[PDB]
Amino acid sequence: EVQLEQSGAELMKPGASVKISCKATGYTFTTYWIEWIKQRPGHSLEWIGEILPGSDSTYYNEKVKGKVTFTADASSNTAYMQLSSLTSEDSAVYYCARGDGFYVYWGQGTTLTVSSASTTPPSVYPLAPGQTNSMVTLGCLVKGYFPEPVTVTWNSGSLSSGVHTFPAVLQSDLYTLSSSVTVPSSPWPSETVTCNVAHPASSTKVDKKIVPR
């Protein structure tokens, strides 16, 4: 019944500041420390520190001192981690976790992207083929967007098997991503196959039907 909810993905410029929230539900907020953990791409976990909600007691373990400040609002059962003087070294996924010696309850993670790159909507292109191989593989190219993330679905989520949505790749301040969907040859072009791309950062929702060339 315990669950920590963190704030969403954040994009901020270097030198700027960001505040990440962590709301705890399911226990007496002020009786447990809230832990903050940093994790970079395919790297290990780094304990940033902790704060005891309702006591303002804290322990800081961040690399560059003074850039991290923890606060908590016992009134809203929410703890916060504010990162200031942001640099690229701060881009990472930050987790919140209840302090139980071990960490059993974790937040879902909040991804921070430190960059001066401007938010840009994605361009979505249908990837139509030429049973081609028992099944036929279709795809959607999602390029020129910023920042992460983008969520891709096929036929509004009705198609998940045979779907491969690849991690985006950054290039010149613009992310490019693609997703492939392998369906039986009888299903397409017989039945419609559509990829749905959403990029909240730019209030962008695109539906690109995969039509035969």
Binding site: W47, G139, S178, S180
Partner: protein, 212 residues
């Protein structure tokens, strides 16, 4: 700071194999050592607490042991769903620290990649852009090398590669390779080739098309 060193850094195991992962602390931490399993894009999941104590909802196959500076996370009969990164973490000293993690993936029969190449869409072309996408799906092992060839010449500039985590269904891997060029450039060539070099074959899998 107490440093936790995990071993091995990575390992491939076949379902049914018993596994023992190592985590060593630079100094004593008593029994204040915990284990986690983390799947890509998910927070770590607590497997074992205080060296050997169980966590509800965790398959019995997982167990932990140790005392002092040597700790072990054992998996009796590892299963396909067990792939991921395993971390140990100590709470016997401040600051709290985590091991470097052990990347565990499932060993499975070799599988050649299913390669699909896609020319630039009419839409992208209309925008003045040109991207050639190549999918190398469901292959194994993970190690693979893709190379683009335009009219016979290997192109490295403008190529973007991305790999997926190990598949939770068939333990395979997949990769996407995007060769981007200006429309003009694309229009200056005919043969676009995607070559996949995988151990499942002496000769690499090659898929191409002619702008026609």
């Amino acid at each position: 700071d107490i440093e936790l060193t995990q071993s091995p850094a990575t390992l491939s195991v076949t379902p049914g194999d018993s596994v023992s992962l190592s985590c060593r602390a630079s100094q004593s931490i008593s029994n204040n050592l915990h284990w986690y399993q983390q799947k890509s894009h998910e927070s770590p999941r607590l497997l074992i607490k205080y060296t050997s104590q169980s966590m509800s909802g965790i398959p019995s196959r997982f167990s932990g042991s140790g005392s002092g500076t040597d700790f072990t996370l054992s998996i009796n009969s590892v299963e396909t769903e067990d792939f991921g990164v395993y971390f140990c973490q100590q709470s016997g000293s401040w600051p709290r620290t985590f091991g470097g993690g052990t990347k565990l993936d499932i060993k499975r029969a070799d599988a050649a990649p299913t390669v699909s190449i896609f020319p630039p869409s009419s839409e992208q072309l209309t925008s003045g852009g040109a991207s050639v996408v190549c999918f190398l799906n469901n292959f194994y092992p993970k190690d693979i090398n893709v190379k683009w060839k335009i009219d016979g010449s290997e192109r490295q500039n403008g190529v973007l590669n991305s790999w997926t985590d190990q598949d939770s269904k068939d333990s395979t891997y997949s990769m996407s390779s995007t060769l981007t060029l200006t429309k003009d450039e694309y229009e200056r060539h005919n043969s676009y080739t995607c070559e996949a070099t995988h151990k499942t074959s002496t000769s690499p899998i090659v898929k191409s098309f002619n702008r026609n």
